[PDB]
Amino acid sequence: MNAPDRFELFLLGEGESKLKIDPDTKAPNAVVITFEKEDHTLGNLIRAELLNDRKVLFAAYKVEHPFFARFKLRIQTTEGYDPKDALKNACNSIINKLGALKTNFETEWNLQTL
Amino acid sequence: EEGPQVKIREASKDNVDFILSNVDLAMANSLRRVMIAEIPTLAIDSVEVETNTTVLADEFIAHRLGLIPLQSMDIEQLEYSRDCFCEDHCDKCSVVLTLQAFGESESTTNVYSKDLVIVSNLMGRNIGHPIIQDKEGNGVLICKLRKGQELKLTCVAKKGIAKEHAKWGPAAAIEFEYDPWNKLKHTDYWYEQDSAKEWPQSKNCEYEDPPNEGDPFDYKAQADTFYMNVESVGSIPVDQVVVRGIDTLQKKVASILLALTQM
Amino acid sequence: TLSHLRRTNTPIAKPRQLHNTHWGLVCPAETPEGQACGLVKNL
Amino acid sequence: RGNLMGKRVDFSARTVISGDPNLELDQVGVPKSIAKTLTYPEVVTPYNIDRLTQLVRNGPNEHPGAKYVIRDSGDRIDLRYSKRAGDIQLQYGWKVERHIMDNDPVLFNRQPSLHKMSMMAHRVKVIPYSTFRLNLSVTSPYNADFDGDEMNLHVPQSEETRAELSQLCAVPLQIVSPQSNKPCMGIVQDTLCGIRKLTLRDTFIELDQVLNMLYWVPDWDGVIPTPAIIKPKPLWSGKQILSVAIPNGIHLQRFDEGTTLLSPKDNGMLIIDGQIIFGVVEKKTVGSSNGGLIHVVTREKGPQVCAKLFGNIQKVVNFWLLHNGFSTGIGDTIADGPTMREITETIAEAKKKVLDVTKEAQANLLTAKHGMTLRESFEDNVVRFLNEARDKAGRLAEVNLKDLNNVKQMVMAGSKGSFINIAQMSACVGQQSVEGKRIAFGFVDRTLPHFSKDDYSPESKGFVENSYLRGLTPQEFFFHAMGGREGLIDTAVKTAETGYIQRRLVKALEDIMVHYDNTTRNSLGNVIQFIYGEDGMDAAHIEKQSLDTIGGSDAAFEK
Amino acid sequence: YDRKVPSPTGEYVKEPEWVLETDGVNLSEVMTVPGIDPTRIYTNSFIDIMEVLGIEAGRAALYKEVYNVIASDGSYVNYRHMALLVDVMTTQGGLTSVTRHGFNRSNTGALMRCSFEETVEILFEAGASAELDDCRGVSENVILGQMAPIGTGAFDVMI
Amino acid sequence: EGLVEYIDAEEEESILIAMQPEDLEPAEADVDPAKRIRVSHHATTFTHCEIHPSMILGVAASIIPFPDHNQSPRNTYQSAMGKQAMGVFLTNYNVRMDTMANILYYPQKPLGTTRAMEYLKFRELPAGQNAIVAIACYSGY
Amino acid sequence: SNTLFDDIFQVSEVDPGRYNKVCRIEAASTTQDQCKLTLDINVELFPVAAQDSLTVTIASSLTRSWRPPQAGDRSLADDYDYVMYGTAYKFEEVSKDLIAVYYSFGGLLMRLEGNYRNLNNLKQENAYLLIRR
Amino acid sequence: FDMGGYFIINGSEKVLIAQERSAGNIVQVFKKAAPSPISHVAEIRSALE
Amino acid sequence: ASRHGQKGTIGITYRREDMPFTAEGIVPDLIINPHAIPSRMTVAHLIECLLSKVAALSGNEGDASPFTDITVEGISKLLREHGYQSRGFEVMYNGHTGKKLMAQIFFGPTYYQRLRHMVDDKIHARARGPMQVLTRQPVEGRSRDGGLRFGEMERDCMIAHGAASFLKERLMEASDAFRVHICGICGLMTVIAKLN
Amino acid sequence: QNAQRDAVTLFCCLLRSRLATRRVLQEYRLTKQAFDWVLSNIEAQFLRSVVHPGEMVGVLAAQSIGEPATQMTLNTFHFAGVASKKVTSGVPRLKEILNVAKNMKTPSLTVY
Amino acid sequence: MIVPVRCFSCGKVVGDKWESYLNLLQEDELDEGTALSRLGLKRYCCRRMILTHVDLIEKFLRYNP
Amino acid sequence: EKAIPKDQRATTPYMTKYERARILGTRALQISMNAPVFVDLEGETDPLRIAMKELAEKKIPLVIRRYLPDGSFEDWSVEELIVDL
RNA sequence: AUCGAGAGGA
Ligand SMILES: O=c1ccn([C@H]2C[C@H](O)[C@@H](COP(=O)(O)OP(=O)(O)OP(=O)(O)O)O2)c(=O)[nH]1
Ligand SMILES: [Mg+2]
Ligand SMILES: [Mg+2]
Numbered sequence A: 001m002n003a004p005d006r007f008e009l010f011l012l013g014e015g016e017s018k019l020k021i022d023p024d025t026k027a028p029n030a031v032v033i034t035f036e037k038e039d040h041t042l043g044n045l046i047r048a049e050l051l052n053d054r055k056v057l058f059a060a061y062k063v064e065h066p067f068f069a070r071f072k073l074r075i076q077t078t079e080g081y082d083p084k085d086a087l088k089n090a091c092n093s094i095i096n097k098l099g100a101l102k103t104n105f106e107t108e109w110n111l112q113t114l
Numbered sequence B: 001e002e003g004p005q006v007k008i009r010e011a012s013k014d015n016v017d018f019i020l021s022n023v024d025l026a027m028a029n030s031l032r033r034v035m036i037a038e039i040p041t042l043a044i045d046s047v048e049v050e051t052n053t054t055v056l057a058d059e060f061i062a063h064r065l066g067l068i069p070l071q072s073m074d075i076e077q078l079e080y081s082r083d084c085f086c087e088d089h090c091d092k093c094s095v096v097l098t099l100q101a102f103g104e105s106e107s108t109t110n111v112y113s114k115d116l117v118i119v120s121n122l123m124g125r126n127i128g129h130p131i132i133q134d135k136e137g138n139g140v141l142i143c144k145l146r147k148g149q150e151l152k153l154t155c156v157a158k159k160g161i162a163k164e165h166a167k168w169g170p171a172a173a174i175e176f177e178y179d180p181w182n183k184l185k186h187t188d189y190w191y192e193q194d195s196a197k198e199w200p201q202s203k204n205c206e207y208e209d210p211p212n213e214g215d216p217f218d219y220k221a222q223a224d225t226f227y228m229n230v231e232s233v234g235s236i237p238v239d240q241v242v243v244r245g246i247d248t249l250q251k252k253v254a255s256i257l258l259a260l261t262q263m
Numbered sequence C: 001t002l003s004h005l006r007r008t009n010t011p012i013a014k015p016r017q018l019h020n021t022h023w024g025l026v027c028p029a030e031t032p033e034g035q036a037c038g039l040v041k042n043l
Numbered sequence D: 001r002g003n004l005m006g007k008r009v010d011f012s013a014r015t016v017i018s019g020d021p022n023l024e025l026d027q028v029g030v031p032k033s034i035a036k037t038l039t040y041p042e043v044v045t046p047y048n049i050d051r052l053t054q055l056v057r058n059g060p061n062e063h064p065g066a067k068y069v070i071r072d073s074g075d076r077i078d079l080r081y082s083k084r085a086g087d088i089q090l091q092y093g094w095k096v097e098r099h100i101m102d103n104d105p106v107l108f109n110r111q112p113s114l115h116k117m118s119m120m121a122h123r124v125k126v127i128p129y130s131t132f133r134l135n136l137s138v139t140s141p142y143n144a145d146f147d148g149d150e151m152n153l154h155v156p157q158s159e160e161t162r163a164e165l166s167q168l169c170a171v172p173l174q175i176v177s178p179q180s181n182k183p184c185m186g187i188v189q190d191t192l193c194g195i196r197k198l199t200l201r202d203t204f205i206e207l208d209q210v211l212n213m214l215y216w217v218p219d220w221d222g223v224i225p226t227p228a229i230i231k232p233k234p235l236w237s238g239k240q241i242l243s244v245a246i247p248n249g250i251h252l253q254r255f256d257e258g259t260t261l262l263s264p265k266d267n268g269m270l271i272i273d274g275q276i277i278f279g280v281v282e283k284k285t286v287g288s289s290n291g292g293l294i295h296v297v298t299r300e301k302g303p304q305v306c307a308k309l310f311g312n313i314q315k316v317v318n319f320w321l322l323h324n325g326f327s328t329g330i331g332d333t334i335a336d337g338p339t340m341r342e343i344t345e346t347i348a349e350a351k352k353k354v355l356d357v358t359k360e361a362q363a364n365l366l367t368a369k370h371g372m373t374l375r376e377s378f379e380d381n382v383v384r385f386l387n388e389a390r391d392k393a394g395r396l397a398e399v400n401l402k403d404l405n406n407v408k409q410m411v412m413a414g415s416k417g418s419f420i421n422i423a424q425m426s427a428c429v430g431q432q433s434v435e436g437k438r439i440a441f442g443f444v445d446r447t448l449p450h451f452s453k454d455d456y457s458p459e460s461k462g463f464v465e466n467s468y469l470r471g472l473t474p475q476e477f478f479f480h481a482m483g484g485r486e487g488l489i490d491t492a493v494k495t496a497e498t499g500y501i502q503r504r505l506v507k508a509l510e511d512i513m514v515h516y517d518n519t520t521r522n523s524l525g526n527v528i529q530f531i532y533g534e535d536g537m538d539a540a541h542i543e544k545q546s547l548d549t550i551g552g553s554d555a556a557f558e559k
Numbered sequence E: 001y002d003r004k005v006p007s008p009t010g011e012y013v014k015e016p017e018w019v020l021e022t023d024g025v026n027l028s029e030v031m032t033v034p035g036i037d038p039t040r041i042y043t044n045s046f047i048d049i050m051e052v053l054g055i056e057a058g059r060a061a062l063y064k065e066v067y068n069v070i071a072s073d074g075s076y077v078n079y080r081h082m083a084l085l086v087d088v089m090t091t092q093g094g095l096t097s098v099t100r101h102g103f104n105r106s107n108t109g110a111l112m113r114c115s116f117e118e119t120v121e122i123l124f125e126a127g128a129s130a131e132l133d134d135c136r137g138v139s140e141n142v143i144l145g146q147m148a149p150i151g152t153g154a155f156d157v158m159i
Numbered sequence F: 001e002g003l004v005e006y007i008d009a010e011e012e013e014s015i016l017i018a019m020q021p022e023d024l025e026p027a028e029a030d031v032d033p034a035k036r037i038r039v040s041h042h043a044t045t046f047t048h049c050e051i052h053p054s055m056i057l058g059v060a061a062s063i064i065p066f067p068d069h070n071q072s073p074r075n076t077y078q079s080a081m082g083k084q085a086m087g088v089f090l091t092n093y094n095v096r097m098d099t100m101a102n103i104l105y106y107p108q109k110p111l112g113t114t115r116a117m118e119y120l121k122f123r124e125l126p127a128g129q130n131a132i133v134a135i136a137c138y139s140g141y
Numbered sequence G: 001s002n003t004l005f006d007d008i009f010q011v012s013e014v015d016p017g018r019y020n021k022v023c024r025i026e027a028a029s030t031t032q033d034q035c036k037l038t039l040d041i042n043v044e045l046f047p048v049a050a051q052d053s054l055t056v057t058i059a060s061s062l063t064r065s066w067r068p069p070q071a072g073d074r075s076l077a078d079d080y081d082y083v084m085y086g087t088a089y090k091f092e093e094v095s096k097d098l099i100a101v102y103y104s105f106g107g108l109l110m111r112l113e114g115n116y117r118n119l120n121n122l123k124q125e126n127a128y129l130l131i132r133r
Numbered sequence H: 001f002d003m004g005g006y007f008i009i010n011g012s013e014k015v016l017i018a019q020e021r022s023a024g025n026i027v028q029v030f031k032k033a034a035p036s037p038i039s040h041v042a043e044i045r046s047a048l049e
Numbered sequence I: 001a002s003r004h005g006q007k008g009t010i011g012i013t014y015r016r017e018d019m020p021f022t023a024e025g026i027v028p029d030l031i032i033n034p035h036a037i038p039s040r041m042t043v044a045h046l047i048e049c050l051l052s053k054v055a056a057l058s059g060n061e062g063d064a065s066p067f068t069d070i071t072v073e074g075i076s077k078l079l080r081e082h083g084y085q086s087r088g089f090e091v092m093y094n095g096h097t098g099k100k101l102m103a104q105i106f107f108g109p110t111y112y113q114r115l116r117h118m119v120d121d122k123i124h125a126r127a128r129g130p131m132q133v134l135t136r137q138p139v140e141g142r143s144r145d146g147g148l149r150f151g152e153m154e155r156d157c158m159i160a161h162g163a164a165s166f167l168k169e170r171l172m173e174a175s176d177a178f179r180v181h182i183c184g185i186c187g188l189m190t191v192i193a194k195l196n
Numbered sequence J: 001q002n003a004q005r006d007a008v009t010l011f012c013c014l015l016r017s018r019l020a021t022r023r024v025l026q027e028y029r030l031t032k033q034a035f036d037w038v039l040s041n042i043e044a045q046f047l048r049s050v051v052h053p054g055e056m057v058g059v060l061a062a063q064s065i066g067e068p069a070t071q072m073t074l075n076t077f078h079f080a081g082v083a084s085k086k087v088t089s090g091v092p093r094l095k096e097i098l099n100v101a102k103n104m105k106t107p108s109l110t111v112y
Numbered sequence K: 001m002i003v004p005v006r007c008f009s010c011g012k013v014v015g016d017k018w019e020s021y022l023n024l025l026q027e028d029e030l031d032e033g034t035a036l037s038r039l040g041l042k043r044y045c046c047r048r049m050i051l052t053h054v055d056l057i058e059k060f061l062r063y064n065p
Numbered sequence L: 001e002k003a004i005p006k007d008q009r010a011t012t013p014y015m016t017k018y019e020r021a022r023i024l025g026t027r028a029l030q031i032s033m034n035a036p037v038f039v040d041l042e043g044e045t046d047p048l049r050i051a052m053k054e055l056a057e058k059k060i061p062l063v064i065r066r067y068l069p070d071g072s073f074e075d076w077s078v079e080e081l082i083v084d085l
Numbered sequence M: 001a002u003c004g005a006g007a008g009g010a
């Protein structure tokens, strides 16, 4: 009865938009992005992947309260490299691994009987 | 083929068992979380009761009907009511079910999901067909009736995801295990005498090399190669659960790529 | 309900202590805390 | 007493409470419907009118909102009815009864309130669900758990009322209490357990984790510190990142048992500027102890900084803990095959040792200890041979618990459990007692009617050879029951007694206060002390310090 | 007993002593006995210490005795508080118990002594002696709904 | 047929009661270390035997599984709470009309029971569920 | 900048003091007689047995944030296996002429004792330890 | 499953609670408080059944 | 409640994905703290859970009759026969990361009770409402939209803090409060105020 | 002025034991600049340490004694093993003391 | 109160197995262990779902109206 | 009368936590009720934070009347009272 | 609504 609605874990309320990007005031060349209506499914996946890129000085994420779906991702990169480009590559990399994982599974599946 | 590597060891209409190698731990898990909670399915989400002189409470029954698995094959061509421009719902987005039974005999009268009747135009697609894996043809006993008792209701099955209500999950249980011999020192065995004799070796010990005491601890070695088994509840055939899994996860990565562009 | 119907009450030198003679007659565990503890008993 | 010394009040609210690690020490999570019920009257200033005209429009039904707008001419306007509720032009000097919003000062109290710390001002944080949420570290001054305890909250209605709340009653500046010249709050439960686990010299964490932890601290200056290990694989120590949570200019020194600036047991504590040099962080360090980290940080850096310190030590350790895990099984109460035999042959000796004394007393060769009865001395001897029996059996079992034993880890961490607890769970429950004596002959010349008459042996009178693991015998079960009742009884009797003592103390000192000349007086103006506490000093700004001129030889003093 | 006492060289050393321990109290009879130290003899009955050694030694044993309840238990409470209790029980000349007989008999304001115990008869003899009420007691202002002369209201604000 | 007898505390005063037929008299003629340590025979002049020691307990404490492994005041606490637990107080409940009725959707009989439940109608009318519990510091919530 | 100390020690004792990944080690140099070293080593990363002639150094060099190695084109004063980074925290005098320092590597402790450690290991929050072969 | 044993008064089901009292016609001696003249006392509460 | 006086309330609900999971992919309906085990000495709760686990595997009747011959050793033997570490432990993965937990977890079924006392029959909040006739004070009880007692014992805490204004305000603006006319000579409420 | 000298006596003993010449130069090696700074804190912190006129110490003391009272256990004791070590402790003792009770359970002389 | 659909803890449908279970017990005289095994209930959470279950609906149906 | 001259005043020159909590409180009431402000409000809109600023810069025109148990009193401007604490 | 009583929570 004081419970929030269940769809507020995935549906973006009005105004609220998926990403908000903020310039970090601590270290130079670092940024902090808030992700509305996401979680460890995505935060932990982007972060671990954003860490394979050797021009990424820093990358971490965190759900500040488990009541809400928003999580924060902080990225820092080498001079010359934009933090948003590092994210972009991070995503693409994932997406290609997944279209790979998918074709590989389908092929396997069809070779099975029963 | 280029990337992450999959190998089936068993398949049925209900389970797929596979090794999954050349992948990041964070991906394997992320995939399971999505596979559990985020792949769209059809289930009942409105019941309108005309008569319920049963032994059970209205919303008690309504609850049971939620959890009844329904064919979700062609789900991708059905809309969310929140989206669809209809007022309330139509055959473009929702599927209407009926249920009637009256107490006929002296003996107790049973009410099974096989008794649900689709009434919406299906527009020829594989949607809403209360999944029966039962051997005698009637799956999921909804409720029981005496002699003169009656139940007459109307259901509306809609597209949804586990995150909303757990009824909407095609998941069941997902077995997930890496590094069966603990070569990675990801765990620390609790014991009284001797670890190995005290803890049972997992079935997946045959698929990896023995640790060998004569070797120092490998500190570069990483979480890679994952033994999984995905079980399907019924609404989507197993393979598809993993596939729309891999897919919905790909789709939601992209929604971000996209979001970077607009702003 | 089964509990309530087998209850004892005791109005007003050591009336609250589980006395040796209770053994078998009055449950040694079941009694309310505080206030009227060990005065109210169950069989 | 019932309508003047205390009365039922408006603007006060009540619910079940729950703990929330991601909440600030001085915050309080207010369930949102409550937040929509309770109101603050606020005058209309050019500084607020943009927040207020907006807030009026939102109306009584959506959160950040208002009912009732009071104008001059005294007259109210009900924002739930009234046709002009989506109209309305606020004048300067009108009042708007707004809803309670994030960061409003509110009095928060748990009963019985017996204490200044049973009543603290918190910062509001409106939240979903119907429980007040609080930081675990404000658990103790309130003396509250989360097994269904319930707390009140009173909302200040006036400007200086709220001043008086956030300047006198605020949580941060109740951290260090005049009661005992020591902090009344500290790290507890999970965090206290984890912070030990985290700080072991064995605990190392690698890059991935380290970055999320760093990030978890909201004060963190964005500087990865250099890893203790940079050889084959950059690793950080638990001590290393925990230190990120501890501020600058913070010095602390301990020494426990075998502590030699080289802590060959990793005990004691040395913290040299924001950095921990050696020693496991536990209770004596980070509890509500006297020369502890909290005491120091409050005193050195201020309440505000110290308040946030709880926040940080939690956010990290809790995070670390989540990903390490911690449990406790029944396997954690099983001694030793060989150890069980020892414990058994240890009780068994104390059995014969009692036999012998008894056998002695029965043959009239027992002598009375000066000033006590013949039979009194026997009871004394026997009761002693049996307490020693239990305690020795207990230590035999404690010695045998490995460091990986979860029970033993909560004991070492000082988070929950004692020696007696290990003892009774796995060695031997011990002697039972009522009225300060071993079990009484309730039936004539025996304790239960399964015994013979004039039987004085251990088992006959309440000794419980078994442990909670092995299970009590029928007789033992009953005796222990008799002992337990006696405990429940005077817990019910204590709270009655002490509740009255408190009232009388309170009522008898009530009007004693320090006047504007440091003289201590009452309403009558009678001097009680001439200089408060004999030194004019405040109890909170005092700590235990060592008087160097007192001890040591006359040579050593001179040198 | 253990006893720490200055060695000939300066430092304190463990020097153990025989101490006699009694059931019952007759103080001014046993101190005058030959062979004992009359200077360090002690009794828990502070109500006797008060009687033989006067009010101050009373105050001192009373405190020592209250302190001993806390400490023996395992708790610590700063001295200034017990000192204040002990002082309050003692600034009247003898021992005033924290009881409707002790402190509440004092001639503080009627309104504030009535709020404790014996509410009505404290208010009867108040009407009978025509008592003047100070209105400096916390409780009297609580009762009147005014701002008590307390912390915040201990003074005045002015232009 | 004089196989069983009634006794009140007064009479209890004059009798020697065994605790179990076997472990309290088969004679004298090896041991399991896990088992709770026994008293003795040590008195061989019995007049009566307990029907069963567990009957010393009332109706509420009869639901507690392994009470002889619990510290006694807890046992008292559980008997305070057994009374407050939702269940199915009667079968005809859809027919009665009384202020306040609480029924569990899916009552389960518990997985560990007592022989006393059999006579207390608890597995027929349970109050409780078999929840898969995990003992762990997780979120810290 | 630059080295601060050097010597080949001979390990006299390896003790696993109630730990699993760490060991306190006892060693003395073979080149110099009045010199000794006690040390906490991560014995999962760099295993050490009794009488294992290790080489030991301190530096202060090869401050901002630590960036990941990315040693595509890098160079650190490491020709070595095991390498730590710590803080000096007591410089002790064992009278007449003997001196001893204490180092902490976030808890992994070191105690070194000699004399010609003279105009060398200052009050520096610096110091890296380097061990080889 | 209903066990009975309760009454019903104005459609409210009522339970009578057992009352503990001391038994009559039993004779008992009681050592009495030291600040009183009576050393011991024997007592009987005699009533008709 | 469990049936060993283990009270206590829900602090939060995680969906199945955020829960810790076993390798077979089981997940807890419930997580309780290892920290409410060792002071309370409720070993029966531990034994239940171990026993209950074997029932559920073998399909048997968990017998927890007090004074019987069943042992934690006995049970454990039976439990290892079904293929699990005999003391009730089980390797688990954190659900956020997939990463294996360092610590193993005692994990098994355990009879739990749902008691009366649910939050939404306690949440109570007043900000002015109905008043008693006699004392012009807030009425008693939630079920009637009443106030909460600010007791004399709480009034003490407020005095200790020195909060004089806030104490006056609780005891005037909230709750009571009234204006009367006083005789300057007699000092009584005799004055008839023909006010206005 | 006399009361003021006393109020401070004990702190000055600590003050001199610490800020004594040999120490200030040999143990903790202060310089003229650090030393005035030390003399400057010690004053400030001392003034910040004084009690505030206004403090309600009456109530503060009561609650500082009643509150740990409510945490006390064993109104018997663990002295119990000995049948004569029965010195009235814990809450029933507080009850006597606060009551100035003429007839206490365990009167005792301790004789030196 | 009728067999619940879907095991609580995991989500496997068990609501269609009550009839069969009662028959494997009565008709083939099997034991609840091998009964449960044969119905394809391996994980012990789903096993508890059916083994615990008490079918009170029978007694409810016994009231005439 | 009674009073006490600005000389021979024996009470602390420092403000007490209770003096300042009331001062802030009192000023916070005036600011909140639109009365004029004597400081450069660097974007502060909170009436109490504004009273805190006016304090830090000793531009609050109030006087404390400290009472003595005899009845006599000492006056202190908020200007002259030290606000360490 | 009020007076009483009883049950129960921390
Ligand atoms: O210094 C202490 C003393 C006790 N306890 C805990 C131990 C146990 O978990 C609980 C038992 O004490 P008690 O029975 O007095 O209180 P409770 O258990 O918290 O129950 P409740 O809150 O209902 O009074 O208090 C501590 O954590 N620290
Ligand atoms: Mg507690
Ligand atoms: Mg509680």
Ligand SMILES: [Zn+2]
Binding pocket: B081, B084, B085, B086, B088, B089, B090, B091, B092, B093, B094
């Ligand atoms: Zn539609």
Ligand SMILES: [Zn+2]
Binding pocket: K007, K008, K009, K010, K011, K012, K043, K044, K045, K046, K047
């Ligand atoms: Zn299941």
